[PDB]
Design a protein around this ligand. Structure first.
Ligand SMILES: Nc1ncnc2c1ncn2[C@@H]1O[C@H](CSCC[C@H](N)C(=O)O)[C@@H](O)[C@H]1O
Ligand SMILES: [Mg+2]
Lengths: 238, 199
């Protein structure tokens, strides 16, 4: 069965035909910090005000291609991510489907990371079977690049294509990130009210409210909790 | 010439200027990341620039070749304009260091200004069964044929099961030389009168 030919014949994407741990999710939920969030116009905001240095950064700049205030790769590459990343830390960068697959790699290296995974969000069109100038093929996926600096899941997320104008990325990316047990200082840049989550600090221009206080946030990670992975039991006090 | 053609050779040494120009190039290099490999310098030095004036290059990559392949693509004179993902399944359409890997990537580069290709007919995801080690899905030949019907194509590092109509296949595990295009036959005889491809 050639699903490529089938797509040409019917408009059903090949991915439409792909078919088909709790205690760990529980420990992650137990060690999560309270959700913290800050409205900030990141083009005008000194991100060095975001402390302490993060173990994980999820970066979701609003690309123009998502719409069919947007950020260009010129804008993104000039973010000073290296100034808020911990010496050992990770980044997850949503790059879209076009020039971002190249420029996002330039960004990772500019900020001092090396790419260790390429996570592909594959979009089915089961509910609606049936266009960049340079494109050779219909683009039916997006890429989230994982980078590392310093010293159970698969690299695929499959969901139905969202309705037009919905720019949300699949919440499954958080599941992947959290299952790595990388540390508890987790930053989501260009998050929204709708993405706020326990265990994350969310910073973005469209947030309607803020609760972030740098001293309070830092107090979540002061000793003896400085080095927890986010997948182990809380440390007893008193 | 329509039926399959191939040349058993060391792609480092073959004078590929004898093969003429191609609408589509595809390569599955043995990146240095089962058979022998090529060093990063050997890959960079391959004379890909002579193979095309206007068309597309399909370059399979894994691991750090996701980056090295991008470098090679650009050094050879291409811009990366698409990226095909092959989701690897078993016969029942189930998917087979930090993450388990369910896919392989094929970079799509463009050189010049291709005219008359049927861009946008296929999508950029292949769902196809895994076969023997390193055997890429035959679906890609159909996508390439719909993209550029009837034109001449060349595959680098192909094995016998890769030979296809409209394609010339190069690789060191092919069996001898099978050339039918009279222009290619003539130029091969001039360049290699004793049929031997060294240095
Ligand atoms: N220097 C060289 N010249 C030509 N072929 C080479 C080579 N070094 C390695 N190879 C060959 O390149 C191939 C890489 S595996 C290619 C897999 C192929 N696309 C498929 O679908 O089956 C192997 O056959 C290997 O022997
Ligand atoms: Mg055209």
């Amino acid at each position: 069965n050639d699903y490529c030919q089938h797509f040409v014949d019917t408009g059903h994407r090949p991915q439409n035909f792909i078919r088909d741990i709790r205690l760990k999710d529980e420990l992650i939920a137990k060690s999560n910090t309270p959700p913290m969030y800050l409205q900030a116009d990141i083009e005008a905001f000194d991100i060095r005000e975001l402390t302490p240095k993060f173990d994980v950064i999820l970066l979701e700049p609003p690309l123009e291609e998502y719409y069919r205030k947007c950020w260009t790769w010129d804008d993104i590459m000039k973010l000073e991510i290296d100034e808020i990343a911990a010496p050992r830390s990770f980044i997850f960068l949503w790059c879209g489907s076009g020039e971002g697959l190249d420029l996002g790699r330039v960004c990772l290296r500019k900020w001092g990371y090396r790419r260790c995974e390429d996570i592909c969000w594959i979009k089915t069109n089961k509910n609606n079977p049936g266009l960049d100038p340079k494109a050779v093929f219909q683009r039916t996926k997006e890429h989230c690049l994982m980078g590392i600096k310093g010293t159970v899941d698969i690299d695929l997320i499959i969901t139905e294509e969202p309705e037009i104008g919905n720019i949300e990325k699949p919440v499954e990316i958080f599941h992947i990130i959290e299952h790595f047990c990388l540390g508890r200082r987790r930053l989501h840049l260009f998050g929204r009210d709708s993405t706020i989550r326990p265990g994350w600090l969310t910073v973005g221009p469209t947030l309607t409210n803020s609760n972030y206080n740098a001293e309070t946030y830092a107090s979540y990670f002061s000793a003896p909790n400085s080095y927890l992975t986010g997948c182990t039991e809380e440390i007893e006090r008193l | 010439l329509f039926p399959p053609q191939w040349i058993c050779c060391d792609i480092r040494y073959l004078d590929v200027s004898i093969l003429g120009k191609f609408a589509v190039v595809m390569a599955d290099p043995p990146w240095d990341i089962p058979y022998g490999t090529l060093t990063d310098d050997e890959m960079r030095r391959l004379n890909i620039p002579v193979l095309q004036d206007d068309g597309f290059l399909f370059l399979w990559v894994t691991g750090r070749a996701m980056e090295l392949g991008r470098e090679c693509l650009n050094l050879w004179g291409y811009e990366r304009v698409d990226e095909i993902i092959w989701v690897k399944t078993n016969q029942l359409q189930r998917i087979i260091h930090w993450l388990n890997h369910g896919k392989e990537h094929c970079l799509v580069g463009v050189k010049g200004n291709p005219q008359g290709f049927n861009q946008g007919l296929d999508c950029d995801v292949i769902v196809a069964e895994v076969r023997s080690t390193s055997h890429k899905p035959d679906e890609i030949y159909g996508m390439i044929e719909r993209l550029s019907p009837g034109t001449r194509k060349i595959e680098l590092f192909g094995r016998p099961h890769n030979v296809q109509p409209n394609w010339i296949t190069l690789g060191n595990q092919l069996d001898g030389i099978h050339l039918l295009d009279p222009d290619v036959v003539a130029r091969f005889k001039q360049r290699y009168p004793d049929g031997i491809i060294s240095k």
